[PDB]
With several copies, the nearest count.
Chain A
Amino acid sequence: HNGKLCDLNGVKPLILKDCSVAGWLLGNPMCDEFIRVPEWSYIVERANPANDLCYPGSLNDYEELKHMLSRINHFEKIQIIPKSSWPNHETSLGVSAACPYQGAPSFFRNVVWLIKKNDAYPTIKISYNNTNREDLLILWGIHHSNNAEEQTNLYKNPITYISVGTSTLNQRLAPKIATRSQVNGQRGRMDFFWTILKPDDAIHFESNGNFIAPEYAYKIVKKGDSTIMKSGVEYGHCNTKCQTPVGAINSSMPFHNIHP
């Protein structure tokens, strides 16, 4: 093998470099190269990518989401909920130093951290009907605070919930206000969640606090053969029919011993 990543039948792969799948899909500030992504043939990820979830926490069913990305060749990102749809909540103060952008604190771009506005947090009751003709990947989250002082300082409500409801999804959440150790400089956590919204189906969000509200979702506009490749090999500006993580194969042999 010549030890380079090539195009699979003339389609450029999605090479995330130091970004991860979670940082890409949630919109990491250190992944702004991949805000608008064309159609790919396969996804290339590093073995230990530096730009993971910048705020500490987790993406729930992350490996199920990565299994669904082996059957998706193109996303077309749309703004399902604009930031002007939150008049009574602060959409600009939700930043942290764990997600820095050019030295200044920032946040994920595909979701909005909603802080209390005018020392109040009214109960969010918002819905989005999928009027498109294809499936929609919607990512939201919950912020687990550190103490009750942080809970009153950020959301004004001591006991909050998050209700998410679709045709097949019934979700009720509550923040786990506890003491953790410092990961990435922050003591709080953020559990992120995803679903696939079918056409002619609505998603309903209800919360009175701790809501990492979605702004950008992803339209699944193409399905087909794909994979997520764990490879540190650089791009080679080349085309091929067979690709391995260590390098593409351009031969007609019945066997190879390059990579499983």
Chain B
Amino acid sequence: QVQLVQSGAEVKKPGSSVKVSCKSSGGTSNNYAISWVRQAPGQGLDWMGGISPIFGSTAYAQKFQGRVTISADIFSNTAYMELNSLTSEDTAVYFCARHGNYYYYSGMDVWGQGTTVTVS
């Protein structure tokens, strides 16, 4: 089975940047799309983007375009998400989620445990 293991929780100041990884353990995830979904406290899930590394697609949300950087490592089976220019609105719980195929239309059946980022 494949389990997605993320990095620990991050405490950041405004104006800084946070980099969150998502290591695919128990098998590779280079042939599937790994999305990055955040969840604000008291709000719903929000899509930030994703990367399909062997397929070569790196997608971003239009409300996150130019501010988030999502990259993947296919030799360590790790997908990364770097978010710059942190404000108090960027406080959320950040999930990596593997799709059912190479692209983003399919359901996200494998999820990471989450990474809580608090900006203060």
Interface residues of A, Cβ cutoff 8 Å to B: 252-254
Q: Which residues of B in the span 63-80 have a Cβ within 8 Å of any Cβ on A? A: 73, 75-76
**B interface residue count range (under 10 / 10 to 19 / 20 to 34 / 35 or more):** under 10
Name B's interface SS. Answer: loop
| Chain A interface helix/strand/loop/mixed | loop
Tell me the smallest distance from the CB of B17 to a CB of chain A, in Å. Answer: 19
Residue numbers in A under 8 Å from B73 (CB-CB):
252
Listed A/B pairs (5) with beta-carbon separation below 8 Å: A252-B73, A252-B75, A252-B76, A253-B75, A254-B75
B74 — nearest CB in chain A belongs to which residue?
A: A252
In the complex, what's the smallest C-beta–C-beta distance from A240 to chain B, in angstroms? Answer: 16
Who on chain A is nearest to B75 by CB?
Answer: A252
Which residues of A lie under 8 Å from residue B76 when comparing CB positions?
252
List the B residue with the shortest CB-CB distance to A253.
B75
User: A-B pairs with the 4 shortest C-beta distances?
Assistant: A252-B75, A252-B76, A252-B73, A254-B75
Enumerate chain B residues within 8 angstroms of A252, measured Cβ to Cβ: 73, 75-76
Which chain B positions have C-beta within 8 A of A254?
A: 75
Q: Please, which residues of chain B bring their CB within 8 A of the CB of A253?
A: 75
Question: Taking the nearest CB of chain A, how far is it from the CB of B93, in angstroms?
Answer: 27
Within 8 A of A (CB), among B33-48: none
- Determine the chain A residues whose CB is within 8 A of the CB of B75 once the complex forms: 252-254
**Min CB gap A242→B, angstroms:** 13
What distance in Å separates the Cβ of A256 from its nearest Cβ neighbour in chain B? 12
Shortest Cβ distance from B78 into A: residue: A252
Closest B residue to A254 by beta carbon equals B75
B19 to chain A, nearest CB (A): 14
Digitize B80-97: 1 where CB-to-A-CB distance is under 8 Å, 0 elsewhere: 000000000000000000
